[PDB]
Structures are given as C-alpha cells and as structure tokens.
Design a protein around this ligand. Structure first.
Ligand SMILES: CC(=O)SCCNC(=O)CCNC(=O)[C@H](O)C(C)(C)COP(=O)(O)OP(=O)(O)OC[C@H]1O[C@@H](n2cnc3c(N)ncnc32)[C@H](O)[C@@H]1OP(=O)(O)O
Ligand SMILES: CC(=O)SCCNC(=O)CCNC(=O)[C@H](O)C(C)(C)COP(=O)(O)OP(=O)(O)OC[C@H]1O[C@@H](n2cnc3c(N)ncnc32)[C@H](O)[C@@H]1OP(=O)(O)O
Lengths: 175, 174
C-alpha cells in the first residue's frame, strides 16, 4: 500500500510549487516563496518527491540545513560520552506531503531519505542527529514513532539520532 | 609553498604524539580527542601527511555543522519575523607543526576545509565557515583571507563560502 511511484530531486524551476497543499499554510507558503531561492542561496536545501508520470507534480518535500545545540538541551541518550559541549546536528526544517497523498507512507519515506542524506554528509563534515521542531502534539507524536526524543526543556523540539536512523534504514533494507 | 603532503581522515595509523604546533590545547586535542570525535561523528578531522611518511602529521583541521543566531551575523537579512539561524560549518581546529609553519600549509588546509564544507553544503546547506580565533594574531591571520567578525564577538569570524568558492574555482580545485 506504500506509495512508491515517485522519484526524488532537488527543487527546481520546472516543478509545480503552486499546486501543493499539505494542509498547513506555512509549509505551503515556504514551498511557494522560499524553497527554491533558499536552495540556490544555500541556506537550506529542499528535495521534492515528484510523480513518475507527471514530473511537475510535487507529492511532498523536505528541507535540511546544518545546525548545533547547546549541551543543556540534548538528552543524555545522545550526549553520553560526548563531553559537555555543543552537539552538531542537521535541522529537518520542513517536511510535508500533499493532502491528496497523505497516509500512504510518503512522509515516512521522505524522513528516512532526509536522514540518509544527512548521514552521508556527516561522514564528511560531522553531525549526529536530525533536529526537528514539531508543530503540535500530533506531529510530535508522529516523529516520536520513529525514535525521535524531545529536547530537555523544549518538549516540541526533537532529536532523531543517526544511530536510530541508521538502524531503521538497516532493518528496512534502505541503506 | 610546502606541497609534499597528502590529505586523509584521521585514523589509527597516524602519529598523533609527534606533533607540536606550539599550542598545548591543540596538541592535546589531536592526541586525546580528534580520532574518537571523528568516529563518534561530533567533528571530522583531516590530517596533512608527509608524502615520505604516511604516519607523519604536518597539520590538521577539524569541522562540524553549526548554526548562529541571526543577531550575531553582520548583515543577516530575515525572510520572516521570527528567530532564525544562519547555517554554517565550524572550523573548530586548525594547526600546523611548529617546524613547518610559514610555508603555506595552514593556508592550504583552510582552503581544503572550505572546499570540503562547500561540497557537503551542496547536499545539505550551509553558507560559511565559523572560526573562533585564539588571539588577535590568529584573528588577523584569518582576516587576511576575508574572514569578518561577528557583531559582538571580535574574535569569532565568518568566512563566507562565496569567498572560498571563488578561490577554489580559480585554482581549479572546484
Ligand atoms: C519539521 C516540520 O515541518 S513539523 C510539520 C510536519 N508537517 C506537517 O505537519 C504537514 C502536514 N502533514 C503532512 O505533511 C503529513 O501528514 C506528514 C508528513 C505529517 C505524514 O506523512 P504522511 O505521508 O501523511 O503519512 P505516513 O508517511 O505516516 O504514512 C503512514 C505510513 O508510513 C509508515 N509509517 C508511519 N509511521 C510509522 C512508524 N512509526 N513506524 C513505521 N512505519 C511508519 C507506514 O508505512 C504507514 O502506513 P501503515 O501505518 O498503514 O502501515
Ligand atoms: C581555528 C583555530 O583552531 S584558531 C588557532 C589557530 N591555530 C594556531 O594558532 C596554532 C599555531 N599556529 C599554526 O598552526 C599556524 O601558524 C597557522 C595555522 C596559524 C598558520 O599556518 P602556517 O602554515 O604557519 O602559515 P601560512 O599558511 O600563513 O604560511 C604563509 C603562506 O600562506 C599563504 N598565505 C597566508 N596568508 C595569506 C593571505 N592572507 N592571502 C594569501 N595567501 C596567504 C602564502 O602562500 C604565504 O606564503 P608568503 O606570504 O611567503 O607568500
């Protein structure tokens, strides 16, 4: 039942950013107004899930950028053995699926794709987790279902460690 | 310019004891932390190895992803009303053995660190190297490559990828 008739690419000028509605105006507007320009500037890189038949149709997207957190915010399961210093991460700044395609596994595939992409980059430049600011309790619970864990004093901000993500990629044959 | 060296990720074969850049904190980092931090993923360290002795470290640098709050970055323009970060890579360490200093190895490793981070940023973002200078002397060294201080921290500098890419493209490295 999982939707797989799509392919991943960097956001580009040919893609239909207007005909996307994930149900959250802020994410729709980011795709419309900011994703492509930010990608070219380098402030955040956005990747789209494109329909295999209509290559202009965006089924979903995610966006990443390098970041860091102070030691006080990081749960000990991640910071154990690292010393009392800033923790390098990648922020998953955006993740969205078009409402017409939701609940079909595309969000899960995109989260794992983002994690794989950041893990690969971290082999060159460092980083140990994805940092996620969840919009609400429901979204927070969605990320917790993949092993993301809340920051120490910010319950809606989560860390999904590359250790957790690597194990999930392994168990699902996605390495 | 000293060029009889090659670059590798820090590993178990390299001689981390026989290295002295004249700064004890940086020697101790190389001895105690560089390799373990590389394997843990908190910072990646790359060494300049003598072409005649693959265990001999002449210099090294270390990098990691980071972010800076808008308020620290000169000229940071916002697309929203809320708090935002400028995505960077920290150049956490840069050092050259005292016997090899003044021969352009530090400059070469700075450009190598910039190249490596620019290439990663093509996948995952980032716009500059962030450098915490040890003192005024080191601060001026980085300023010699166009590094600009943060707004309220004169010893912390940003070296834009715009600057680094121009040099690497001109020299054929990118
Ligand atoms: C960082 C931020 O931007 S936070 C804001 C996040 N974005 C939004 O809230 C925008 C609005 N919502 C959306 O875009 C989407 O609904 C998302 C991204 C939240 C969810 O993605 P969707 O594609 O809608 O749903 P999802 O990918 O969960 O599809 C469910 C399938 O994924 C997989 N899946 C979901 N959760 C799990 C899990 N915990 N473990 C294993 N597999 C899972 C399964 O295959 C599941 O199908 P099944 O439960 O029927 O077997
Ligand atoms: C991030 C941190 O860790 S801050 C702490 C920095 N590290 C230290 O302080 C440790 C102790 N010091 C050192 O390890 C070294 O002395 C360093 C890294 C500071 C300098 O590296 P070195 O290899 O000693 O010096 P450097 O690479 O500048 O050698 C000079 C050559 O570099 C090149 N170079 C240096 N500055 C410039 C410049 N502004 N523009 C162009 N080329 C330059 C030139 O080729 C120059 O040779 P020339 O002036 O004879 O033509």
């Amino acid at each position: 039942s999982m939707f797989t008739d799509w392919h991943e690419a960097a956001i580009g000028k040919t893609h239909n950013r207007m005909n996307f509605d994930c149900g959250d105006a802020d994410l729709n507007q980011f795709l419309q107004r900011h994703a492509r320009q930010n990608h070219e500037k380098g402030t955040t890189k956005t990747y789209v899930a494109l329909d295999n038949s209509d290559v202009t149709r965006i089924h979903g997207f995610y966006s990443v950028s390098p970041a860091s957190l102070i030691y006080a915010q990081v749960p000990g399961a991640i910071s154990k053995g690292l010393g009392r210093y800033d923790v390098p991460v990648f922020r998953l700044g955006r993740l969205a699926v078009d409402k017409s395609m939701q609940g079909q596994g595309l969000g899960a595939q995109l989260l794992l794709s983002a994690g794989k992409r950041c893990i690969q980059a971290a082999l060159q430049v460092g980083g140990v987790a994805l940092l996620i600011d969840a919009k609400n309790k429901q979204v927070c619970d969605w990320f917790k279902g993949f092993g993301a864990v809340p920051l120490n004093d910010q319950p809606l901000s989560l860390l999904l460690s590359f250790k957790t993500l690597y194990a999930a990629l392994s168990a699902s044959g996605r390495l």
